[model samples]
Target chain A: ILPDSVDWREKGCVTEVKYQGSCGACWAFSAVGALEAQLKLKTGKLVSLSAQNLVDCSTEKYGNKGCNGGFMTTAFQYIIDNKGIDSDASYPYKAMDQKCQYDSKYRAATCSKYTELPYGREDVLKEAVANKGPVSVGVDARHPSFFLYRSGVYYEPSCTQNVNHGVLVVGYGDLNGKEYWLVKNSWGHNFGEEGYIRMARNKGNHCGIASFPSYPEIHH
Target chain B: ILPDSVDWREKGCVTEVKYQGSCGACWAFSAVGALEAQLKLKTGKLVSLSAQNLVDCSTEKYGNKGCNGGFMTTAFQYIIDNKGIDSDASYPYKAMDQKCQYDSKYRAATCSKYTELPYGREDVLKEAVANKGPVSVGVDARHPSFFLYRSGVYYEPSCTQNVNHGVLVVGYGDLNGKEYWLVKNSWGHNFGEEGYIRMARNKGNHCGIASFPSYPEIHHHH
Candidate 1:
C-alpha cells in the first residue's frame, strides 16, 4: 500500500530545525533526527533527541570522529551501546564537541536496530519513508547553488557524487508534475523552506541522497 | 605500462594449492594467499602462511566467525592488529577450527596496509593485478557447473552477482582469442587446472572477480 506522497512533518513527527554551526556534527543532527522521528512514530510522543549526546559521546576509538564527523549507522550503534539517548532538553546542543554528560534518566529514545538503504536505491528510500519513518541521508553539499537554495525543487546538475553533508528526507511529493523529496537540514529555520528543501527526486541519485541513507528502528 | 597477460604462478610468486576442507574459511585462504605471495615478491621467500592461525585466532568477538565464515577485509585487519602471522610449518592448517597456538616468532609476513578496488571496476583490478602481486577476489560459486568447470575461460552465464567463495587472481592472459583471468583456488590440486581456474575477464565482471578485489601491502619488519 505505497502511497503517492508522505510527509511526516504534517503528521507531527519532525522536530524544530536547529543549527549545527562551526562544527562538522551534521552526522549527529541527521542521526538524531531519524531517531526522534522514529520514536514519535512508535510511541505517539514527539520528543527531541540529543544531537549533543551523540556529538560528544560516540567517540573516535570506534570511529565516530564526533564533531569532526560521524556516520548514522555507527551513531545508531552508539545509541544501542549506550542503552538510549537523552532528550535535547536534558543533554542539549552545544554546536561543538565536549565531554559526555549522558544521564539516562532523560532517555528520550531507544532503537533496537537500524537499516541502510542500498546505494542508488531511490525506490527503497521511498519505501522506508512511506512505511517505516523519516530516513537520514548524506548528500553532496559542495555546489555553490546549494547554499543559495531558497525554494523550488533542488537539482544541482553539478553536484558531486561523494557525500559531504548529513540530512534527512522526511517525505516525497510531486509539484506541478515534478517529483521531489522533502528534505530537512540542520542549518536552522533561516535556511530553505524553514530549514528544509525540496530536492529533485529520482534524478540520478542527485547530490548522493541515495549514496548513504539509513534509519534506526525503535520499539517500545 | 600494464601488459596483455601477467601470471604470478609463472613468476614464481604463487604457492601450491592446499585444501580448505568443509570450513567456511575461504576468506582466510584468500587473505593468506595475497599475503604469502606478496611476501615472496618482496623478499624472494616463498613460505606458506597459516590459514588455521587466522581461523582459530582471529576471534568471533572481533567477528571472524572462525570455521563458520569471515571476510578478507577484516582478516587483513586482524593480521595487522596481531602484528604478523605464523608460517604453515609452525602453525599448519587443520581444516577445522582449533585453539590458536599463534607463535608470532614464526611470523612469515607483515602487511602495512591494504587497497580495495572499486566495485565493478575491471580496469582498476587489472592495474592492481599487474602492478601489485596476486590480488584476492570473491566470486559466486553456486551454479552446479561452477563446480564441474573443466576448462576454457570459465564463465557461468547464469552466475549470480552475490559473492559466495573467496579466491585469488594471480594473473591474466589470452586463450587463443579471448582474454581470461588466471585464478588460484584453495580446493586442492585436483580442482580446475591443478587447483586453478581460467575465469572470463573483461566480460561484465564475470563471477564477480571485480566485485571485491583487494591485496595487502607489506614492508620488511624485524
Candidate 2:
C-alpha cells in the first residue's frame, strides 16, 4: 500500500491525455486510462490500448451503449471477457457509433480483474491512486462550469450525485492550501489544466467523484 | 475569394489547444474558438477568449444549459448581448456550472454579429473558414471509435446528423488525395492528432460538420 498522497504523472504511470471527441465514451476512456496506468505500473511499459475496443465490444450484455454512455465496471468486465484489447495503432479511433469491428487477434493486453473502492471515500481514492495506478471515477459533468475549468479545486454546492461523465483519478495533492484530487479527463488537452482537473478532495465526495472509483488489476 | 483549400493553423489563425474538462460545454468552446479565429483574422492578433463566460452566463432564456448543454447560436447571441466577452487569461475558466459572474468592464473583444451557413453545405463552410475565419459546427460525437482517432481523415458510415457536440472547422485540405476538414475539438490536445480531427470534408456533411456552420463577424475595416 502506498501513502495517502501521490501523483501518477510524476511517477510516470499515466499516459498521454486522450480525447473522446463528441462521443459520450468518457467511460471507455476512463477505463482505458486506468488500465493503461495499471499495465504500466505492473509491466513498466505504457501501452496505448484502444478505448474503441471497449466502446465497440462492450454492449448490452456488459451494460454499455457504444457511445450513448457506459460504465467502467462494465468496461472492465468486457475487457476480461474479451481476453484483452488491441493497441491504438491496430484499432484506431473513428469517433462514431458503429457495429462492432473487434478483432480478438489484435489483442495487446488484458486485465486479470478489477477492484472497486468503497464509494464516497476520498482517503480510499487517494490511497488507490498512490499505491495502484489511475482509478476510474464518475462525476456530475452536466454542470456548465465544468467546461470552463482552467485550474483550482473545483467545488460547487449545487453539485449533485447524478453522475454523467467518467474520468480517471491520476493523483492527489494540495494547491494553494486546498487539498484536491487530480483527475484526468478525456476531453483532450484544452478542456482542463492540460486535460486534468483538481477536484476538491475532502468536499463530501464533491461532484460524486469518489462515488465509483475502480482500477484494473494488471499482472505481468 | 481565396483558394479552394486552406489551413488556419498554417496561416497562424488558430490558437492553442483547449479542453472543456468534464462538462458538455463544447458549444461554448466551439463558439469561443470561432470567435478567436475571427478576432485574429480582423485584428491580426490571436487572443484566447472565455468559454466559461458563456457556460455561466448564457441560460434558459437563451436556450442554452450553461454546462448541461447549449448551442453556438445561443452562445453567439449571448456574446453579442453581453456587449463583449473576456479574454481567457483575464476572466479565465472554472469548468463547473455556476451563477453568472459576467463583467462587461472586463470585455476584451466584441462581435458585430454572427452568420449561420446552410446546413449540410460543405461548400459554404469551406468558403467561410477560408475567407472569413474558423466556423463553428456540430457533430453527433456518439461513437466509440472517435475516441481512438489519431491522424487521418475521419469518416464513419455509421456517423449521423444528430448533433450533440460543438467544434470549430479551423481549415480544410486534402491528405493522401482525400479531402478533409481540419476540426478543433474542445477535448484537449491529448485526444486526437494533437487536439484536432481531420473530418471528411465533402462526404455529404458527414458527422454534421456542415450543419449549423457559423462564425462571428468582427469589423476590421471599420
Candidate 3:
C-alpha cells in the first residue's frame, strides 16, 4: 500500500525529454524529468523544471564532463537536503544551464520527499503502480532500436548492443497492444509517440524506473 | 571459423563482475576484462588485467572522473593503440584502485586480436563457444538472481533494478538442471563457483549484457 503522501490522482504523464544535445547529463535530465511531474502535482503548475538545476547543482559523480552520466541517488539526496530552486525566476533553461544562481536566498531547493526503499525491478514497478508518480531507474539499453529510436510508437530494439542512460516511470497502462508503464523520456519528443516509449511491463526493471526520495536534515 | 590471430588454447574460464562499488569505471574494467582471455591466448599469461591502466591512461574521451563509466569501444581502441599493459606491473588490485598515477615508461603488454564483433546475446554465447575467451558485455542486472547473487547460485531477489557494468563472458554450458553461460568475476575467487556466475544461455541480451562486436562495427572489424 502507498503512503498517504503519494497522490494517485495526478499520475505520471508520458513525456518526451528534449534531448539536451551531446550533454551527457542523463542523470540531471532524468532527475528533473521526474520533478516536472511531481511539481505539477504539488503546485498544479506544469513547469519546464530545470535540468540545469540538477546539472549545475547536483553533487553526484558524473561519468564524463559533468555531461555524460551521473547517480540519481546523489542528486535526490541533494534535493532533499536543501530547498529546491524555482523554474520561474531562478534556474532557467539553456542549452546547458550553468549559472550558479538561486531563486530565493532563503528558499533553497532540496530533494523530493518519500518513504520506502524500492527493492528491484518489479518492486520499483509495484511502488510506481501504487504511487503513480516518477521513479528513477537504470537501464541496459543494449538494443539498436533504442539508439535508432526514431519517431514512432515504442519499438523494441533487436540487437543486444544497446545500453545507456537512466529514465523515469511516469504512469501505468496497456498501450503496446499490452499492459505497460507509461514512461517519460529526456531524449526529446521526436522519438517515440511524442517522446513517450511503450515497453512490455511487469517483466523486470526494463519498464520500471527505480527511485528513492530524500528529506531535509532538520532540527526538531 | 576462428581467426588465425586468436590463440584459443587458454583455460576458457568465465567470470562475473561485482557491482562496481559505487564507481562508474565499468567500461574501462570491461575492456581489459574482455581482453583477459585474449591476453591469455596471446601470451599464455593468465594475469589479471588492470582497470586502472585503462582508467587513468586511455586518452579516449571517457567523460567524468576515471570513477564514472565510459564507452567500451574507445577503451578497446585505447588498448589496441597502446599495445597493452600488464596487470601486476601497472596497477594493483585495490577494490577501487584509486591511484591516478601514470608511471608508464613501461613496456606495452597487449592481447591477441579477434576479427569479428559480437552482435547479439547469441553472438556472446556463440563467441564464447567458438573462441573460448572472455567477451565483454552489458546487462540489465536488475534481476532478483543478479542482485542477490551469493555463492555459486543466483538467489532470486525480490527486485529487478537496472545496473550497468562490464563482466567477462567466459564460456557457455548448462547448470542447475538448466543451460547457462559460465561467467567469471573480478570479485575474488570464493564468490561464485571459484569466481564464476551462470547466466542462462540463449537468453540473448534479454538481461542487457549486450554482446559486443555489434553491427557496423562488426563489419568494420571483419
Candidate 4:
C-alpha cells in the first residue's frame, strides 16, 4: 500500500544521521542507512551499522575503491556472502578509508536479500520508501547548488542524471503541493536539513535520485 | 639461466586477445587491456573492460582525442579520476567518437595509479614485463610491413623512432636467438598470429617500443 505522505523518522524507523567526513564511501553509509532502517522496522530497535567495516574489507571484491569510488549492490552482496556485519558500537565510523579488516565475530545483523527499484521510476521509488522504510540511492552531486540545498523541495534545473554520490531516501511527502523525497545524507547533521534534504519528487528523476535505488531485506 | 622464453599467456595472467576496429583508440584499448590484467592479478577474475569508456570519456583535461589518437597515460588518468571503469559487456567499443555515457553502477574494475618506464629503456621495459604483468606500450606502425606482419621476430631497420601506434608488451623472450617483445596487437586475430606479434627488442628500442611504456596498479589494501 502506498501513502500520500510518509516519513520514517516520525515512525521512529530512521536512525540519526552519521558523518562521512573526507571520504567517498557514501556507498557504505548509503547502504547502511537502509539496512539500519530495515532492522529497526522489524524489531523496533535502531542500530547504527558499520560503514567503516565495509569500507576497509570490501576493497577488492565489493567494488569500493577506498576514497575514490564504490557500489551499493556489491556492498549488499559483500554482507550477504560474508554472512553478517558488525555494529557501529563495535566497528564505528573511522571516516578515514582503510584496508579490509572486516571480522565476522563483531557481527551485528544479517540481510537475507536486496531488491532494486527500476531506473527513473520515482513512482515505484515512492512506493518502496513509503512501504519499505529507507532505500539506498544515487544522484548527481556535481552542481554547486546541490551543496546549497538547505530547505524546501530542493530542485536544480541542471542537475543531470550522472550519479556521483550515494545517498539514502528515508521517506516521501509534499510541501504545499510540491512533491519531494526525504533524503537522508551522510555528511553528519549539518549538510542539509539535519543531514537530510527534501529532493523534488516526480521531477523527472531529479539528479537521478531514482536512477539507482535498492533496499536490503533484513532478517534474523 | 633466465630460460629461453617467458610468456605471460602460458602463466594464465593475460586475457584472450581482443580486436580494436577502425579506431585509433588503440590507446584506449591498450589502457583498458592493461587494467584488465590488474583485475586478474588482484581478484583472479579476468574481465574484458571497455575501450569505449576511455574513448568517449578520456577527453579534455585527460589529453585524449578519442579516435583521433591518445596517450595511455591520459586514459589511465581518466579511469583514476572517474574512480573506475565499465566492462566491454557494459560499454562496448563503438570504434568511433561518442559522448560520455558512463554509468558508474556497472564498473568492471578500478585502477589506483599508473607508473611509466624510462624513455627508450627497452631493458627496463623488459624487466618490468618480466616481473609485473603486461605493460601498455607504443610503437611505430607507419611502415606497411607492420600491417603485413605474419610471424617471426619483427625488426624493421627503416621503421622510424616516433611512436605512432599504441600496443601492449605481454612479455620478452628470444625468438630463434633474436630477442623480441611478445606484443598483443589491437588488430583482429586475422591480422597476425592470433592477434599477436613479435616485435624485435634490444635493437636500440626498435620502433620506439620503449619510448612510452607504462602499467596500472590496483592496490590490495590490508
Candidate 5:
C-alpha cells in the first residue's frame, strides 16, 4: 500500500483498455486510454474516453487512418487540437474507422505537435504524473497460455503472444506475493488475471506499464 | 449439460501437469489427467496418476521419456502394462523427474498407443456415460479468450500459452448462446473462469481433449 493520503481508486484506476487485435490504431487508443484516466481523476467523473474520436480525428494528420499505424507523438498532438476524446460508452467499439461525429459534447477539435524522443517519454511522464495519469504503450506479450488463458491462481505462459495495444496505469500493488500494476483493459473484462496481469514491476518485460504517462491536459 | 448417466465428475477432475513449457511431455500429463479421473470414478477413490512412471517406465518401448518429447500413444501403453497409478495422497507431485516407487495397492502405468482414432474413445465414453462418467483428453488449445469474456468467470491460459495441454472433456453445453466443450484445467484453481473454460465443441480448436481408457491397478501396500 502506498499511503492513506494517496487514494488508489482515485489515482489507482488502472483499467484494461482493449485493442481490436489486428487493428493498427493502437497508438490512438493508448493516447486516449491515458487521458481518460487522468480526466476521470481531474473531474472526478469516470468518463469512457474515446478511441473512435482518435480514429477519425487523429488520422492522416498523424499517420494514416484505420489499419495504418503512426507514432504516438502525433496522437498527442491530435488530442490537444480536438481538446479531448469522448467516452467509449458514447462512441462504442466498431473495430473500424469512420468519419468524425464531431460530438463536441465529448470530443476535441484539434491538438498540438507530436513529441519525438527516444527516452524523453520519462521526462514527459515526470511532468504528466504530477498532474493526472500515465500514457499508454505497446509491447510484445507473446507468452504461451497468454492466448488460451481462461483462469487459474498462478499463470506463466510457455511462450510470449506479442501484446499489442495500450491501457491505463491506474494503481500498483502486491497480490499473492507478486507486485503488479493495476491496469484496466478493453478486451471486455474476461481476459488476463481478471482483465489485469501481474508483470514484474522491476522486470522490463511489461514493465513499460509504469514508464509512460500522458499529458495533464495538452497545452495548445 | 451431459446426461446424469454420464459421470462428469469421474472425468471432471483436472491437474496442471506443467510441461516446464518444453519437453513435449504434455502427452504424459494428459494421459495421467484422464486416467486419474477414471480411477476415481471406478473405485470411488481419488488417486493421483504417475507421470514420472510414464516418463521413466514407458521409455522408447512405447515412445516417451523425460529428455526427449514423448507421445500419448506410448504413455497409454505403460499404463496397461503396470495396472494403475496411485493418488497424490499416496504418490505426491514431484517437480522433477524421478524413478517410480512401484506400489501394487493402487498403481497405474502409462498407455501403450494413442488409440488409432476416436472409435475406442467414443465406445468407452458411451459406456462411461452409461456408467456416469465423462472422458479426459490431451488437446492443443491455442486461442482461448478470443471470444468476449465477462468477469466472475474462470480463466486460465492454455498450455504453452499458444497450445493447451491435458484437459477434461466434461460434458458439453451452450455459452453466450454458442455450443462449447467445457474443459477443466489444472492450474490449481483460482485461474481462468475458475478452473473451467467453455471451448467450442464439435468445431473446437484442439483435438477435442484426446480421450482414452486406463484400467491399471498397483498391488502394493500403502
Candidate 6:
C-alpha cells in the first residue's frame, strides 16, 4: 500500500544530487540518479554514478545524441550489456559532448535489469517509487516557464505530448493540498528547487511525467 | 559545515505546496510557506497556515493590495502584531482580494518574532535555511524568460533589479558544478517545474532573491 507521501532521499536510498550543467545530458543524469538509488537500496551504500559515462558511451547505436539528448531506457540497456557504469569520481563530469573515453577499467556499477512503468498511471509510478526506489522519467522541459519556476506544484496545461528532458522521480508527496511528483533534474542546483522540482500529480500527466517513467532492477 | 545540498521538503518540515492562481497574492503564499516551515520546525508538526488570512487581514496597515500584490515582510509583521494566524481550513484561499474576515477565535498558529536577512548574501541565506528552516523572499518574476521557463538554471543576463513577485527560499544545493537556492512560488503547479524554480546562486543574487529574505519565529505554549 502506497502512503500519502514517500521520499527516497529520506529513506537513505538517494545519492547526492548532481548537476548536468549546460549540457543536454539530462538523460544520462536521470538514468544515473535512478541507478544510484537502486544500488543504494540493494547494497546499503550510496554511490555517485557517473552521467559523463553515459553521455559519452550510450550514443550511436543506443540512439542518443551525446549531450544533445537521449533516452533512459537506451542508456540502461547499454549498461546492462556493458556489465557496468563508472563512478562520477572516476570519470568526473564535463558539461560538453566529446568523443567516447569510457574504459573497462573504471566500470563502477551495473544494472542487473530494467523495466518501464505503465504510461500515464500515477498509481503505478508511485508504487514503483515506494517499492523499487527512484524512477527515471522524461518531461516537456521545453516551456520557458519551467526555467523561471521558483516552487509549488508545476502543471502546464500546454505541456502535453512532448518529452524532451529526462529527470528522476525520487518520490511523491502532497503540498498545500496539491499532490506532486518530486522530481530531481540535471540542470544543476542553480535550476529549479535546488536541482529538483515538484511536478504536478494527476492533471493528465502534464509534461508527460507519467508517459515514460522507468526504473532499473538491482539484485544482490 | 553544511553539506553541498539540503531540502526542507525532504526534511519533512515543509507544508503542502499551495497555488495562488492568477491573483497577485504570491506575497501571501510566500509568507505562508515560510511560516508553515518555521512552525513545523518549532512544533514538530506540519500545519497549513493561511495565505487568504493575509489577503483579508494584512491590507491597509501592512501596505498590501490583496490579490493585487504585497510584501512578505509586511505580512510577517502583521502576524507578529496580531499574535497569531488562522489555518487554511478556517480562512481558505479565494485567490482574489476580498474584505477582511479574520477572527481571533479561528487562530491556529502564531509567531513571537520575525526577521529579515541581509541583501545579496548566499552564505547567510544558506545558514538561515540550514539552521532556521524556510525564508520568505521577493524576486523579479516578470521577465518573459521567466514566463517560458520550463527547466534549467534561469539566468536572464538582462534581468534588472525591480522586484514585483514574492516567493519562499526553502534550501540550497549544487548541480553539475553550479550552486543554487531552491525557491517556492505560488503560481500553481502548471507553472515552472510544478510551481517551483531554482534561482541562480552566488551570481550577484539574480532576480533579487537575496534582496528580501525573511522568516518568522514560532513560540510554543504547550
Tens digits of lDDT, candidate 6, A1-220: 6689988888787776676654678899899999888787777888888888888889899999887889999999999988889888898888767777777788777888888888899888888888888999999875545665668898765576578888899888999999999998765565678778999997788788999988998674
Model 6 chain B scores worst on lDDT over the 10 consecutive residues at B141-150
Q: Measured against the native two-chain assembly using Cα atoms, what DockQ does each of the candidate structures obtain, in the order listed?
A: 0.01, 0.11, 0.02, 0.01, 0.09, 0.07
For candidate 6, what is the TM-score? 0.52
Each model's TM-score?
Answer: 0.50, 0.59, 0.43, 0.51, 0.51, 0.52
Give lDDT tens digits, candidate 2, residues B19-102.
Answer: 676577889999998888778777788889989888888888778887678989888888777778888887777778888878
Reference-based lDDT, residue A62, model 3: 30
Q: How well is each residue in B1-222 modelled by candidate 6, as lDDT tens digits?
A: 877888899988777668775567888888889888877776778888879989988999968889777888888889878888988998899776778877788887787777889988878988998888888888886444565466667787756457777888888887788788887777667566666787788888798888878888877623
State model 1's lDDT. Answer: 0.85
Shift in Å, residue B123, candidate 5: 11
Candidate 4 lDDT, tens digit per residue, B1-222?
Answer: 344567877767777776665456788878887888788888878788988998888887767889778899988888888888988888887677999988788888887899999999876787788778899999988553566566889887666678888888888888668999999887766556887889998898899899989999988411
**How big is the positional error of residue B180 in model 1, measured in Å on the Cα after superposition?**
0.9
Best by DockQ: 2
Q: After superposition, how far is residue B197 of candidate 5 from its true place, in Å?
A: 3.9
For residues B50-148, write the lDDT of model 1, one tens digit per residue.
999999989875778887888888888888888889989998887777988876788888788889989989889988889888998999875434554
Predicted model 4 interface RMSD: 24.4
Q: Residue A216: error of model 4 in Å?
A: 0.6
Per-prediction TM-score, chain B alone: 0.96, 0.94, 0.69, 0.94, 0.62, 0.94
> Top TM-score: which candidate number?
2
Find the 10 residues in a row with the least total lDDT in model 1 chain A.
A141-150
| Local distance difference test, each candidate | 0.85, 0.82, 0.50, 0.81, 0.49, 0.81
**Model 6 ranges off by over 4 Å:** B1-222
Candidates' RMSD to native: 18.8, 8.5, 16.2, 20.0, 8.9, 14.6
